[model samples]
Target: KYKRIFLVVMDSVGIGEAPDAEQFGDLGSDTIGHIAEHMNGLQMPNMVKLGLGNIREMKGISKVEKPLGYYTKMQEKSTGKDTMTGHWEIMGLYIDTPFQVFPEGFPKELLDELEEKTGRKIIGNKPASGTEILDELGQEQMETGSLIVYTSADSVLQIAAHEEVVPLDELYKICKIARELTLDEKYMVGRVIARPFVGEPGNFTRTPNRHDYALKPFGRTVMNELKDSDYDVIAIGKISDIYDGEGVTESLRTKSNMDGMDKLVDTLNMDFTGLSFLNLVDFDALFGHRRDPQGYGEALQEYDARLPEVFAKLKEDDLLLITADHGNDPIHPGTDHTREYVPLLAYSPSMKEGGQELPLRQTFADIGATVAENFGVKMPEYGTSFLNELK
Candidate 1:
């Protein structure tokens, strides 16, 4: 019996395209595969030992004959290939209606209202890269004090402003206003992001104080269910923000993915009763979205180098679940999350000597269902529990 479970999300480390990926305009997309192909291969011996290579074969990684952990792949049942849908689905909420994505840009009424409410003219009101958007309009935004409002392939409305020009509190206020505006059905978005930047015109850099105002989960999730039973649900990184501070007993914000891992190690050593959920975003934010396969592969290897510390500190009664929300293929066309299947690698010190393989899980909710069953909470109807199969 496991006393605790560490659920770590390698954000945007998807393996291959899902079955229904075609409808999302993501065909022939493989996050891990394309990265491996571009970089000549990846050197993740730690994950390989945990059966990452067995889940699928790519150009650079080789499959292991016997993995140290049970491995499988989980297909997303949600309609969109964005972080909100992926994370929400992992907690047992299957969203049938996809969040509205504005490839063309937000409507004039919405923008007009946001401008009128915030009292700042907007610029860059189309789908664009975060870094490039800042470069394109950073000087003008600093000079005119007009806010930089933009969208992406995913369901998000991003507002970028110089920390010096707009100040952190003021930018957050506008993002909050944008969040309220997008709450309606006609202009629904997954998140309203605060893209705060600093430094001067040609070399402006986005700051670590970036905030995401995500939509609240409509239904009761596993996090809420666990909280109902008086269990601790700790969220690291943007997990608390994603859930809109619902059902989270403790929240730890980090500056980067390495900081997230550092916090995760700290929490792992501490005595926690229920769940510790960690979201590592550097793989997606720094490398994947920038289309740098070399950097993405290096980031994975860096995480792999930190694996031994995680295993050394794992309590006998503790379990570990490593997975991803969605895929952001570096070689994929455009800068967007690709519709793909996430890899599942489950390990526990209490399992048998030889790790067995798990079948392809139908939904991401299986992770939540199993955790609920293990901790004596009632399982949600969204997924079947695999508690009995772990032996």
Candidate 2:
């Protein structure tokens, strides 16, 4: 049995469209493919060796004759393409009821209550990019002391404030109130994000102190099962925040994708007997949402350049699984996450035979099922274990 499993989610680095892409209005959306096309071909040689190219015909990456791992694509069974739904499904729970989104902005009644409770008026109550929203409302917010409240394509209520003007504590307090108010069925949202920024208006920049208050998972996840069985469950980056700190034994926050990789390598050097889950979110948040295909491709290359460090730190008993939660195609029509299939690549130095191809997974829960089966824990109702096929 594998003594440790390293599950790394290159957040929103999906490959191609899923079967249900048209239903979500994400037809012809190919995140990595479009990014590679924009770059004239991506240069992820490290991932190429692990059968990244074998999963699909990417522009720059070519299929190798002998890949070092198993490769396949996994479709999402959940109703939404947001981070929470994707991550939750990967951990075993299937969500059929999609989280509510506010395209025309949040309701007036909720905002009225927030204003009454916080004593601050709200501005920019609309769907917009975070940076764009900050640029447009940052100066006004600084002058009037009103909160910058906004929504996005996802089920998120974001409250942006200047650090010097409102202070982190105050911004967080407002977000907590927003979280509580949004819990009602009429105005439900998946997360309430505290977006704090610094510097002048034209030169404003978001701070690393961003905090997300996510709703707890509806059911027990694989992490909970592993932790209950006395195995270590480590969460890196926003993994803990996404799950509301549920079932996590140790949590490590990260600043950037490179920082996430550094933390993963550092954790790899440590002794652990269970799972270490990491989410490198820059692909989704920084580049994808900004509609910058060049930036997205460059981020992928930068991450691929650091793969050797991760490979060198692996023990013989360590199994590394590389995949993505969802797809946010930078070249897609809107700023929303696209409905697409995420790549699944499994590798371990202990495998006798390498480069085998697995059947396409029906749901993301297959990963949870595999981990549960490997640890001899109780099984989740959704996925089938491909653990026996890992060899």
Candidate 3:
């Protein structure tokens, strides 16, 4: 009975560890539990009421009294726990070939090629946190205008440079070149990010112009299918970046999670009846990787406060879905994304409270299939759909 569907992905808001987590060396990596305990049991009253605490079998959580919404956990079957794969999976594209990763820093050949291409010395070709690495090299780059190249556990190559020293345009150009040059069997990274910053080394701050150049989906996703069928496939925040701008029809960039939420609300006001997707990244980018639990809790609280507003605005013919990509456990040893299960919750005014349990889905693409089926559009060849169960 819904006319439109709003799908929100809480980047890195994993509920618990997956069965195969230990195999991935992510033993005991629980994003929700670790964050809540670290912050002395999160103060997310509104979210707690939304069955957030009952998302999985976890510790340091209290059950919701008069639960506000449905909640369930999902696992990742993709090759990697990186953003592109996660989002692609959610959009009905299953990744078979994982992106390239360099645990011991990139080989000299890659660095030599980049150096030759940029015709300038690049700093910090090592695995480190974004903020810490920027602090370590921001001052030097500010002084010498050298590019700061860094990587984390994810399959990404991030290039940071002070906007004043390197200029946003030039920094983006450098990232573009890096993205293009890194392609091929040996170095098929998922993203080439332009992490532009400002200020001195010790006080370096990430600018608002940070950009992600994601690789194309390994398979055609539902978004592209909808586009081909002449349906609106509007994306908020880095939705464009997540899909490499290949299948997207409209894009709305956001500064943070709140900005993304605001855009979601605004997009809901439009007359479009097709899929309107949103990706809120601050949870992963600003807090999870930084291992800031308090910040993550506050963010959830803010989203919880906005959640009701989203529900209130929902039309009878509209469905609402809340889910997460991969996990970035703050309490984990390193600042890497923990390979944990994602959460999936679906709601509609017509459905009874805490509706019947959803069937065990094959992949995150089931959510995408549901959306495609809703608009009578073509769902990708992957993912299962519980649309009939809901109907």
**lDDT, each prediction:** 0.87, 0.91, 0.80
Residue 355 displacement (Å), model 1:
1.6
Order the numbered candidates by lDDT, best leading: 2, 1, 3
Instruction: Write candidate 1's Cα lDDT for 268-331 as tens digits.
Output: 9778889999999888888877888989988887888898889888887888899999899898
Best by TM-score: 2
Highest-scoring model, lDDT: 2
Candidate RMSDs in Å, in order, are 3.1, 3.0, 3.7
Poorly placed runs, candidate 2 (over 4 Å):
100-104, 112-121, 127-146, 152-154, 160-174, 184-187, 195-211
Residue-level lDDT of model 3, residues 1-391, one tens digit each, is 5678888898899887787888668999888888777767666654555566666534446766445555666777787787888899898888876676677777788888899999878889988787889867888888887888988766889998888888888988899899888886578888888898877646878988988787788888888888888888889997888888766888999998889989999988988867788898888888888888888877876877787788788777778888888899887877778888887777777665545446556688888888888778776787777788774
lDDT of 2: 0.91
Backbone clashes under 3 angstroms, per model: 0, 0, 4
TM-score of 3: 0.84
- Candidate 1 shows a clash count of 0
TM of each candidate vs. truth: 0.88, 0.89, 0.84
